Design a protein around this ligand. Structure first.
Ligand SMILES: [Cl-]
Ligand SMILES: [Cl-]
Ligand SMILES: [Mg+2]
Ligand SMILES: [Mg+2]
Lengths: 8, 235, 235, 8
């Protein structure tokens, strides 16, 4: 499971 | 540039149409054209630039991960299938690197050096960190360490400005901290630094929410939830 | 062609990788390269060719519809915003037409003329009808009628072969009938013909399901459900 | 509502 980065 | 003959305002208008049509490669080409007119970008225009390239590189990153996983499996009792998987992974990788280099080139010529206000400068330095981070995701050889340090340095400069010049709930500051925490966890092999940064960022934002309007509260809490989601995954 | 130096088998292998990576433009370029080697395509290879180009043109069609709707609204108390919406719709339209022309060119040089078995010939004639139908969706001027008749003629030839040579449950025959019914409803202003074709196709397939294995039954009934869904929308 | 055509 990969980490969440900033959304647009 | 193929956009050199188009008016700046028309490029911006078409970037917005391309977004609505989900034509992100076109959107990115229009926004590159707009940047190359040489004028600084407004808030809205910076966001169009970021949306366009994030969507383009996002598709490339997703494809690269699929191909890299196939390539890794092939290198475990696995039958030899020739050079094609590596070749195609390399093709996608090269295209991804090309997009990152394009974005970094726009930032260096000349978006960052003309950005004096904290909102713009932090935004562009965060972008610089992000696109070096995407380069680091695919780097292996004698360049990996220098690419990682370039991402770190850009994020750190952005963090220093953001802490001096922006409130802890500012969405740019929050998104920067979020992405730098991801850098620490996924790139720099520093999960404790990632967790500490996400926790402190979340807590300092929480304590500043009381100052915000309803609309700003919604903006900030949406990003805070991503920090919390990562903390739940990481602990 | 940029694929002229790559082995046929490597192009096919990379088309499959591109599909897994959701890189449909690459997939289409690889399959075009494979077709241009000049050998006939197997069943599996025909399906790769169709998947690749259907996904490429599908994104273009979706974008064109977004832009056309914006353009139509602008031409209703609507403020004049200049030529940009039309220009960008035209850009997407031209690219869509280029993809359709590419597919039609592969069919004409020389996939159709070498296709002797019913499965291949019907498949390619259906494709010819489909890509003329996509051209008809965007046609306006002195070409619309001839494009519509080209789609109709290709579908009709495919229908005639399919009815003589394939059982009513054959998935190619069903998909052809489905798409020809869509042609009648959406292109040719013939909703009654569309409804009649979908009904007869569905009923003749129903009556042949008893001959099928479990796996073939699943294949056929999946497409029959699309016929039923359209009939529910159209009546 | 647009009509459904053949799936891949
Ligand atoms: Cl390749
Ligand atoms: Cl345009
Ligand atoms: Mg301030
Ligand atoms: Mg037969």
């Amino acid at each position: 499971v990969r980490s969440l980065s900033e959304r647009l | 540039g193929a956009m050199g003959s188009m008016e700046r305002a028309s490029l911006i208008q078409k970037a917005k149409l391309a977004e609505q049509a989900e034509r992100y490669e076109d959107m990115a080409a229009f926004m590159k054209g707009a940047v190359e007119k040489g004028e600084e970008l407004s808030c809205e225009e910076r966001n169009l630039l970021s949306v366009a390239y994030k969507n383009v590189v996002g598709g490339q990153r997703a494809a690269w991960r699929v191909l890299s996983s196939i390539e890794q499996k092939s290198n475990e009792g696995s039958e030899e299938k020739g050079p094609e998987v590596r070749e195609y992974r390399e093709k996608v990788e090269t295209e991804l690197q090309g997009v990152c280099d394009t974005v970094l080139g726009l930032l260096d010529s000349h978006l960052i050096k003309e950005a004096g206000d904290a909102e713009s400068r932090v935004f562009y330095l965060k972008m610089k960190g992000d696109y070096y981070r995407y380069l680091a995701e695919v780097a292996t050889g004698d360049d990996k360490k220098r690419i990682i340090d370039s991402a770190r340095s850009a994020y750190q400069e952005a963090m220093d400005i953001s802490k001096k010049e922006m409130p802890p709930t500012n969405p740019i500051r929050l998104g920067l901290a979020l992405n730098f925490s991801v850098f620490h966890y996924e790139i720099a092999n520093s999960p404790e630094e990632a967790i500490s940064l996400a926790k402190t960022t979340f807590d300092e934002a929480m304590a500043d929410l009381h100052t915000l309007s309803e609309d700003s509260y919604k903006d900030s809490t949406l990003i805070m939830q991503l920090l919390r989601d990562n903390l739940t995954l990481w602990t």
